[PDB]
From Swiss-Prot:
This is Peptidyl-prolyl cis-trans isomerase-like 3. It comes from the Eukaryota. One of its GO terms (biological process) is protein folding. Gene3D superfamilies: Cyclophilin-like. Ubiquitous. Detected at low levels. Its EC number is 5.2.1.8. The gene is PPIL3. Keywords: Acetylation, Isomerase, Methylation, mRNA processing, mRNA splicing, Rotamase, Spliceosome. Disulfide bonds: none annotated. Identified in the spliceosome C complex. InterPro entries: Cyclophilin-like_dom_sf (IPR029000), Cyclophilin-type_PPIase (IPR024936), Cyclophilin-type_PPIase_CS (IPR020892), Cyclophilin-type_PPIase_dom (IPR002130), Cyclophilin_A-like (IPR044666). It is an enzyme of class 5 (isomerase).
Length: 160
């Protein structure tokens, strides 16, 4: 399955690995499908590292799962932050996944087994490039200009 994030700076198609991270997938797709991320900004943008979003409050402290409470990590030896465009859930320690997620800008091995990887950017890399060059407050890494996720399209699999 895949989703396309329609942002102020372009679209980003992300393939989600539902066979390895079923709960993370269910959560993400449910939030996407219920317009939960619509209007969300990319609140933390760190060039060379990653960009974070998925917090309706836009502070980096908010957001919750489709279950109204944090859920468990789903780590996998098959899923590592070893390339640009890996998509993972942000957290505040073990099993504290909510709604926030981030997209890496490059290989970041230190993140492995610390955050639940659940997707990969498969199209719209130019959009990721645009996000990475966005001017930010060099102290908080918050983009000087709000960049939002307008809406998200879920590519329904023809198969039931
Ligand atoms: Ni669009
Ligand atoms: Ni706004």
């Amino acid at each position: 399955m895949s989703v396309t994030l329609h942002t102020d700076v372009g679209d980003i198609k992300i393939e989600v690995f539902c066979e390895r991270t079923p709960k993370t997938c269910e959560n993400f797709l449910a939030l996407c499908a219920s317009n939960y991320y619509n209007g969300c900004i990319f609140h933390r943008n760190i060039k060379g590292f990653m960009v974070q979003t998925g917090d309706p409050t836009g502070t980096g402290r908010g957001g919750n799962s489709i279950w109204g409470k944090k859920f468990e990590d789903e780590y996998s030896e098959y899923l590592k932050h070893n390339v640009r465009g890996v998509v993972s859930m942000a957290n505040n320690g073990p099993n504290t996944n909510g709604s926030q997620f981030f997209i890496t800008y490059g290989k970041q091995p230190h993140l492995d087994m610390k955050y639940t990887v659940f997707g990969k950017v498969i199209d719209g890399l130019e959009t990721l490039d645009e996000l990475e060059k966005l001017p930010v407050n060099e102290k908080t890494y918050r983009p000087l200009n709000d960049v939002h996720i307008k809406d998200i399209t879920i590519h329904a699999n023809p198969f039931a």
